[PDB]
Amino acid sequence: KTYTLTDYLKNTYRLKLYSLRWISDHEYLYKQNILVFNAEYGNSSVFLENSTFDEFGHSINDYSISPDGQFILLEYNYVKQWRHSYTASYDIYDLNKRQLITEERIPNNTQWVTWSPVGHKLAYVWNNDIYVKIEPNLPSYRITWTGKEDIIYNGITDWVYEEEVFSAYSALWWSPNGTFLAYAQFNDTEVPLIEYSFYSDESLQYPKTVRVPYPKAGAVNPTVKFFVVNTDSLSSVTNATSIQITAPASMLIGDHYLCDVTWATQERISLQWLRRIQNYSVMDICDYDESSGRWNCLVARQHIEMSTTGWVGRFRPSEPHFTLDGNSFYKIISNEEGYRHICYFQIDKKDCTFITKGTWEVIGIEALTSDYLYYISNEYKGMPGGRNLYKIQLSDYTKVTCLSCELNPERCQYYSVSFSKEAKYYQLRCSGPGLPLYTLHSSVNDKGLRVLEDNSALDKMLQNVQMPSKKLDFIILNETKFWYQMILPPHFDKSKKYPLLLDVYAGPCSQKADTVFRLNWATYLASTENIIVASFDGRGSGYQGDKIMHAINRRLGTFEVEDQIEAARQFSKMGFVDNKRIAIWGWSYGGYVTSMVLGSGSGVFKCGIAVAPVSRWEYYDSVYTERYMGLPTPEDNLDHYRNSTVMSRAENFKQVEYLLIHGTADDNVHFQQSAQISKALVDVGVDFQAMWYTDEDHGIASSTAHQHIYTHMSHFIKQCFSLP
Amino acid sequence: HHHSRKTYTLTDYLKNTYRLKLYSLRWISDHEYLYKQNILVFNAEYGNSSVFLENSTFDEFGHSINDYSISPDGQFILLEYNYVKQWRHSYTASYDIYDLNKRQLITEERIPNNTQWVTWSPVGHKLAYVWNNDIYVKIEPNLPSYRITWTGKEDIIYNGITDWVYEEEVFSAYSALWWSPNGTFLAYAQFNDTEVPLIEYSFYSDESLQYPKTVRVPYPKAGAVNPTVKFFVVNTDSLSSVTNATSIQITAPASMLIGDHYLCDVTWATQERISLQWLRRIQNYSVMDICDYDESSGRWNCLVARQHIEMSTTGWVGRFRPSEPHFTLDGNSFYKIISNEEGYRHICYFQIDKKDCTFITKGTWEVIGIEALTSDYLYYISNEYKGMPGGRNLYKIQLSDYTKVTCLSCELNPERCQYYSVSFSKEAKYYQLRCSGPGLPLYTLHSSVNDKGLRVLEDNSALDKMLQNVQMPSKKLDFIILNETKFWYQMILPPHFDKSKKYPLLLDVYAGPCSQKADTVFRLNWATYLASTENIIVASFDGRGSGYQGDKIMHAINRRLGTFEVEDQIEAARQFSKMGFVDNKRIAIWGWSYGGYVTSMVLGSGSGVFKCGIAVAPVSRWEYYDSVYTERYMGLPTPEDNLDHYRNSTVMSRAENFKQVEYLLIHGTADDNVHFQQSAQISKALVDVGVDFQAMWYTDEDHGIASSTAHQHIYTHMSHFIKQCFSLP
Ligand SMILES: *[C@@H]1O[C@H](CO)[C@@H](O[C@@H]2O[C@H](CO)[C@@H](O)[C@H](O)[C@H]2NC(C)=O)[C@H](O)[C@H]1NC(C)=O
Ligand SMILES: *[C@@H]1O[C@H](CO)[C@@H](O[C@@H]2O[C@H](CO)[C@@H](O)[C@H](O)[C@H]2NC(C)=O)[C@H](O)[C@H]1NC(C)=O
Ligand SMILES: *[C@@H]1O[C@H](CO)[C@@H](O[C@@H]2O[C@H](CO)[C@@H](O)[C@H](O)[C@H]2NC(C)=O)[C@H](O)[C@H]1NC(C)=O
Ligand SMILES: *[C@@H]1O[C@H](CO)[C@@H](O)[C@H](O)[C@H]1NC(C)=O
Ligand SMILES: *[C@@H]1O[C@H](CO)[C@@H](O)[C@H](O)[C@H]1NC(C)=O
Ligand SMILES: *[C@@H]1O[C@H](CO)[C@@H](O)[C@H](O)[C@H]1NC(C)=O
Ligand SMILES: *[C@@H]1O[C@H](CO)[C@@H](O)[C@H](O)[C@H]1NC(C)=O
Ligand SMILES: *[C@@H]1O[C@H](CO)[C@@H](O)[C@H](O)[C@H]1NC(C)=O
Ligand SMILES: *[C@@H]1O[C@H](CO)[C@@H](O)[C@H](O)[C@H]1NC(C)=O
Ligand SMILES: *[C@@H]1O[C@H](CO)[C@@H](O)[C@H](O)[C@H]1NC(C)=O
Ligand SMILES: *[C@@H]1O[C@H](CO)[C@@H](O)[C@H](O)[C@H]1NC(C)=O
Ligand SMILES: NCc1ccccc1-c1ccccc1
Ligand SMILES: NCc1ccccc1-c1ccccc1
Provide long-range contacts, Cβ within 8 A and 24+ apart, for B353-359. Answer: B353/B305, B353/B306, B355/B308
- Sequence positions preceding breaks in chain A, C–N over 2.5 Å: 32
Q: Which residues of B touch A692 (CB under 8 A)?
A: 680, 683, 695, 697
Element (H, E) at B255: helix B254-257
Q: Do A209 and B224 touch (CB under 8 A)?
A: no
Task: Compute the C-alpha angle B497/B500/B505, nearest 5°.
Answer: 60
The residues with which A193 forms a beta bridge, in sequence order, are A213
Residues near B127 by beta carbon (within 8 Å), at least 6 away in sequence: B111, B118, B119, B120, B121, B137, B138, B139, B141, B145
DSSP code string of B268-300: EEETTEEEEEEEESSTTEEEEEEEEEETTTTEE
Provide long-range contacts, Cβ within 8 A and 24+ apart, for A559-562. Answer: A560/A506, A560/A507, A560/A508, A560/A593, A561/A506, A561/A593, A561/A596, A561/A597, A561/A600, A562/A538
Q: Please, are residues A694 and B687 in contact by the beta-carbon 8 Å criterion?
A: yes
B293 C-alpha to ligand 10 centroid (Å): 26
Cα of A280 to nearest chain B Cα, Å = 27
Pick the atom of ligand 8 nearest to B48's CA.
Answer: 1
A108 lines ligand 5 (CB under 6 A): yes
Least CB–CB distance from A195: residue in B212, B623, B709: B212
CB environment B632-655: b (16+ within 10 A), e (fewer) = bbbbbbeeebbbebbeebbbbebb
The β-bridge relationship of strands B285-294 and B299-302 is antiparallel
Determine the length of chain A: 724
Annotated domain spans of chain B: 1-471, 472-729
Rounded distance between C-alpha atoms, residue A554 and residue A506, angstroms? 15
Cα of B77 to nearest chain A Cα, Å = 37
The residues with which B696 forms a beta bridge, in sequence order, are B666
**Surface of A (218-237) touching B: CB under 8 A:** 219
Residues near B699 by beta carbon (within 8 Å), at least 6 away in sequence: A675, A676, A678, A679, A682, B204, B668, B669
Q: Kindly identify which residue of chain A lies nearest to residue B710, measuring between CA atoms.
A: A682
User: Residue A635 to residues A312, A616, A632, A638: CA-CA distances in angstroms?
Assistant: 22, 19, 8, 8
| Nearest residue to A193 via CA among A546, A667, A601 | A667
| Nearest residue to B565 via CA among B655, B490, B633, B500 | B633
Rounded distance between C-alpha atoms, residue B729 and residue B717, angstroms? 15
A238 lines ligand 2 (CB under 6 A): yes
Beta strand spans in B510-644 (E): 537-541, 582-592, 612-616
| Nearest residue to A5 via CA among A713, A724, A564 | A713
Within A438-482, residue ranges assigned H as helices are 456-461
Element (H, E) at A39: none
What is the rounded radius of gyration, in angstroms, for the C-alpha atoms of chain B? 26
Which 3-state string (H, E, C) describes B140-152?
CCCCCCEECCCCC
Count of C-beta atoms within a 10 Å radius of residue B490: 22
Cα of A447 to nearest chain B Cα, Å = 50
Question: Phi then psi for B244, rounded to 5 degrees?
Answer: -60, 145
- Residue A177 carries which DSSP code? T
Q: Which of B159, B194, B226, B232 to mutate to test the pocket of ligand 3 (most atoms within 8 A of CB)?
A: B194
CA A521 to chain centre: 21
Measured by CA distance, the residue closest to atom 11 of ligand 6 is A177
Q: Please, are residues A302 and A309 in contact by the beta-carbon 8 Å criterion?
A: no
Q: Which residues of A touch B694 (CB under 8 A)?
A: 689, 691
DSSP code string of B558-597: TT-TTSHHHHHHHHHHHHHHTTT-EEEEEEEEEEETHHHH
Interface test with B, best of A694, A703, A716 (most B CBs within 10 A): A694
Amino acid at A390: Y
Q: Within 13 Å and on the Cβ side, how many CA atoms surround A165?
A: 31
Question: What 3-state DSSP class applies to A460?
Answer: helix
**Surface of A (191-210) touching B: CB under 8 A:** 192-197, 199, 202, 205-207, 209
Which 3-state string (H, E, C) describes B428-489?
CCEEEEEECCCCCCEEEEEECCCCCEEEEEECCHHHHHHHCCECCCEEEEEEEEECCEEEEE
Within A634-702, residue ranges assigned H as helices are 638-643, 671-683
Contact B342/A at CB under 8 A: no
Strand order in the sheet with B430-435: B420-424, B430-435, B442-447, B453-458
- Residue A162 carries which DSSP code? I
Rounded distance between C-alpha atoms, residue B270 and residue B184, angstroms? 11
The residues with which B131 forms a beta bridge, in sequence order, are B115, B134
What is the rounded radius of gyration, in angstroms, for the C-alpha atoms of chain A? 26
Which 3-state string (H, E, C) describes B152-197?
CECCCEEECECCHHHHHHHHCCCECEEECCCCCEEEEEEEECCCCC
DSSP code string of B209-253: -SS-EEEEEE--BTTSPPPEEEEEEEEGGG--SSS---EEEEPPP
Residues near A56 by beta carbon (within 8 Å), at least 6 away in sequence: none
| Nearest residue to B569 via CA among B592, B546, B535, B549 | B546
Task: Compute the C-alpha angle A129/A130/A135, nearest 5°.
Answer: 145
Rounded distance between C-alpha atoms, residue A714 and residue A277, angstroms? 42
Q: Which of A20, A30, A45 to mutate to test the pocket of ligand 4 (most atoms within 8 A of CB)?
A: A45
* CATH code given to domain A467-724: 3.40.50.1820
Q: Do B681 and A219 touch (CB under 8 A)?
A: no
User: Residue A418 to residues A21, A367, A370, B689: CA-CA distances in angstroms?
Assistant: 9, 9, 18, 41
User: Residue B78 to residues B29, B81, B161, B352: CA-CA distances in angstroms?
Assistant: 18, 10, 19, 38
* CATH code given to domain B1-471: 2.140.10.30
Contact B675/A at CB under 8 A: yes
Q: What angle separates helix A703-720 from helix B676-688, to the nearest 10 degrees?
A: 90
| Nearest residue to A435 via CA among A456, A415, A418, A450 | A456
Cα of B95 to nearest chain A Cα, Å = 31
Q: Please, are residues A15 and A523 in contact by the beta-carbon 8 Å criterion?
A: no
Measured by CA distance, the residue closest to atom 9 of ligand 5 is A108
B593 C-alpha to ligand 13 centroid (Å): 6
Quick one: CA torsion of B17, B23, B26, B30, rounded to 10 degrees? Answer: 180
Measured by CA distance, the residue closest to atom 1 of ligand 8 is B48
Rounded distance between C-alpha atoms, residue A519 and residue A9, angstroms? 10
Residues near B708 by beta carbon (within 8 Å), at least 6 away in sequence: none
Determine the length of chain B: 729
CA A148 to chain centre: 28
DSSP code string of B208-221: T-SS-EEEEEE--B
A–B interface: beta-carbon pairs under 8 A: 123
| Nearest residue to A34 via CA among A45, A26, A22, A18 | A45
Name the method of structure determination.
X-ray
Rounded distance between C-alpha atoms, residue A629 and residue A625, angstroms? 6
| Nearest residue to B330 via CA among B353, B359, B360 | B353
Which 3-state string (H, E, C) describes A321-371?
EECCCCCEEEEEEECCCCCEEEEEEECCCCCCEECCCCCCCEEEEEEECCC
A232 lines ligand 1 (CB under 6 A): no
Question: Is residue B316 classed exposed, middle or buried when 0-12, 13-18 and 19+ CB atoms within 10 A define those classes?
Answer: buried
Count of C-beta atoms within a 10 Å radius of residue B67: 11
Least CB–CB distance from A672: residue in B212, B621, B690: B212
| Nearest residue to A142 via CA among A150, A133, A151 | A133
Beta strand spans in A403-561 (E): 415-419, 425-430, 437-442, 448-453, 469-476, 481-488, 498-504, 532-537
CATH topology for the A1-466 domain:
Methanol Dehydrogenase; Chain A (2.140.10)
Interface test with A, best of B213, B658, B684 (most A CBs within 10 A): B684
Q: Please, are residues A95 and A44 in contact by the beta-carbon 8 Å criterion?
A: no
Rounded distance between C-alpha atoms, residue A381 and residue B143, angstroms? 90
Question: Phi then psi for A591, rounded to 5 degrees?
Answer: -65, -45
Question: What 3-state DSSP class applies to B42?
Answer: strand
Contact A6/B at CB under 8 A: no
CATH architecture of B472-729: 3-Layer(aba) Sandwich (3.40)
Q: Please, are residues B619 and B634 in contact by the beta-carbon 8 Å criterion?
A: no
Q: Which residues of B touch A684 (CB under 8 A)?
A: 709
Rounded distance between C-alpha atoms, residue A463 and residue A489, angstroms? 16
Q: Please, are residues A713 and A700 in contact by the beta-carbon 8 Å criterion?
A: no
Contact B572/A at CB under 8 A: no
CA B44 to chain centre: 29
The reply to whether B472-729 shares the fold of B1-471 is no
